[PDB]
Amino acid sequence: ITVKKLGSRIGAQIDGVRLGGDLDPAAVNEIRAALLAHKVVFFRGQHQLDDAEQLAFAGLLGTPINRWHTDVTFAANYPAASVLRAVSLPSYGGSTLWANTAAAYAELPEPLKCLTENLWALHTNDFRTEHPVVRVHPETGERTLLAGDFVRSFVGLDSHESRVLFEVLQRRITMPENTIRWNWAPGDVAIWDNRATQHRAIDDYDDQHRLMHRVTLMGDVPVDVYGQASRVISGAPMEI
Amino acid sequence: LITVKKLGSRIGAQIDGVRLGGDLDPAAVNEIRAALLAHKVVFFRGQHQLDDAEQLAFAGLLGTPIANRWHTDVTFAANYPAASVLRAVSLPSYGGSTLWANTAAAYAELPEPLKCLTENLWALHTNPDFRTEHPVVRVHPETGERTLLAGDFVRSFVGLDSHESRVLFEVLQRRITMPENTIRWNWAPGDVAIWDNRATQHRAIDDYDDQHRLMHRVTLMGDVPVDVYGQASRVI
Ligand SMILES: [Fe+3]
Ligand SMILES: [Fe+3]
């Protein structure tokens, strides 16, 4: 199977694969590895995928369970990844954005690294979690920025400071050079590494009917560059 | 003779029981120097005898004789002044007060993430074509206190873009100039101020309309800053 790089920082297309439960572990590995490298990966023409068969496919990768965000970061062990398929699409608009939060850390100036490495944030939805702003990716070892719309404030700074620094970091993360905007066709499937991305839907299709189907994979508790784990202030962990 | 009286919990003190001038006791000079370094700006009242001559001579006893935006003096230069001695000559009928902020306390009260940031940030200062790259945290060469070096002569932070620079500059300045960290002085005739330019910012206030206001300043030579790693500011 084949992997086409869609831009220099994020995104790839994968060809030669019919997604579903029957996949050869060597293929499944190539996909996993493509996902970890490119952060978000696309398959086209998967018209045969239905609800049951998406789930089944998801199951080979891990364990099934508007504004820029990482999914369910108001919880401690937020998802590692999702598989999203187009079901019915609008006649125009409806594209989706992803940003690479590992590339975004790696390109911080040294002073902003020192800042983010030591910075922690309260995320909320009731769910309240203090997470580090820089996590060590458990599979890749890359440090990734952890922020997005669930953030309420930063631990130890005031309102005004929190909001300003939040915007500084979000502007780097969402800089067009670090993002991919996907135009959805029928039979499109997307898979993203939620431990190294943010995403955002675009509401540019007037009130048109749109329906996607998503399967989400269970993820772990972030740890910072010192090994300290996120802290539950409020709410339960996610469970299967 | 001399007493030093705290004027605010973070900055400022008045010193009485001292006629300023070239004639001062070395113990008296030292007790002033001490207060200046602890309190960042100090004030002497009723110094009606002082004149240009006696101020310069007094200034000479402290070190070596060389505005309504918040700034540290002459930071576009590498070896910017350590301190200044300033006397009211002619004050307006209203207005004319002056602000100082304590840039050592400002550093010290930074959340640690922000200390990390500032310990590693360098700023380009400019002004007739002066340009220096200063650390944002300098190590005070007499007290060893770490102090924020910023103010209006800053154009940008090194390795950061324009938007970022501005935004972080404003985050810093907001902490530095928080009213709890500042002193606003109402000048009376005979008043003299001395401030440590290595641990302050100051600001004049233009709330006296047209009027004439005249002060006399004697500035003292300071050395080049170094960061917390020993690195010197670099002339461009
Ligand atoms: Fe989402
Ligand atoms: Fe000045």
Assess A177–B contact: CB distance below 8 Å, yes or no. no
Q: Measuring CA to CA, which residue among B58, B53, B73, B64 is closest to residue B19?
A: B58
What residue ranges define each of the domains in chain A, with the CATH number in brackets?
Answer: 1-240 (3.60.130.10)
Q: Which of B111, B157, B164 sits opposite A157 (nearest CB)?
A: B111
Place of tokens 């800042």: A115
- Start-to-end C-alpha separation, chain B: 48
For residues A99 and A210, is the Cβ–Cβ distance under 8 A?
Answer: no
For residues A185 and A44, is the Cβ–Cβ distance under 8 A?
Answer: yes
What is the rounded distance in angstroms from the CA atom of residue A230 to the CA atom of residue A215?
Answer: 24
How far lies B189's CA from each of A27, B8, B87, B156, B161, in Å? 86, 22, 9, 39, 46
Q: How many residues are listed for chain A in this entry?
A: 240
For residues B221 and B79, is the Cβ–Cβ distance under 8 A?
Answer: yes
What is the rounded distance in angstroms from the CA atom of residue A39 to the CA atom of residue A98?
Answer: 9
Report the amino acid identity of residue B166. Answer: R
Residues 6+ apart with CB under 8 A from B184: B97, B98, B99, B205
Assess B119–A contact: CB distance below 8 Å, yes or no. yes
Residues whose beta carbons lie less than 5 angstroms from ion ligand 1? A 71
Question: Resolution of the experimental model in angstroms, please?
Answer: 2.0
Q: Measuring CA to CA, which residue among B56, B31, B164 is closest to residue A168?
A: B164
Q: Choose the catalytic residue: B174, B184, B217, B234.
A: B217
DSSP notation for A45-88: --TT--HHHHHHHHHHHS-B----B-TTTTSSS--SEEEEEEEE
Q: Measuring CA to CA, which residue among A236, A195, A234, A200 is closest to residue A218?
A: A195
| Torsion angle of the four alpha carbons B172, B177, B182, B186, in this order, in degrees rounded to the nearest 10 | 150
Q: Is B134 marked as binding a ligand? A: no
SS3 state at B97: coil
What is the rounded distance in angstroms from the CA atom of residue A31 to the CA atom of residue B158?
Answer: 40
Q: Count the neighbouring beta carbons within 10 Å of the beta carbon of residue B171.
A: 18
Tokens of B61: 């006893």
DSSP notation for A94-108: --EEEEEHHHHHHTS
How far lies B130's CA from each of A16, B120, B201, B221, B223, in Å? 62, 23, 20, 17, 17
Q: Residue B87: which H helix or E strand, with range?
A: strand B83-90
Q: Measuring CA to CA, which residue among A87, A90, A72 is closest to residue A194?
A: A72
Q: Tally the C-alpha atoms within 13 A of residue A101's C-alpha that lie toward its C-beta.
A: 26
B217 part of the active site: yes
Tell me the ligand closest to A200's alpha carbon. 1
Tokens of A40: 């978000």
Q: Measuring CA to CA, which residue among A198, A199, A222 is closest to residue A76?
A: A222
Estimate to the nearest angstrom the gap between the alpha carbon of A78 and the chain centroid. Answer: 10
Residue B111 φ/ψ region, left for φ over 0, alpha for ψ in the -120 to 50 degree band, beta for the rest: beta
- Start-to-end C-alpha separation, chain A: 31
Place of tokens 């300033």: B86
DSSP notation for B123-169: EEEE----EEEEESEEE-TTT--EEE--STTEEEETTS-HHHHHHHH
Query: Which residues 42-81 of A are in CB contact (within 8 Å) with B?
Result: none
How far lies A12's CA from each of B65, B103, B152, in Å? 66, 49, 46
Whether residue A168 and residue B170 make contact (CB cut-off 8 A), yes or no, is: no
β-strands B41-44, B146-148 pairing? unpaired
Place of tokens 């009242």: B45
Q: Which residues does a chain break follow in chain A (C to N more than 2.5 Å)? A: 65, 125
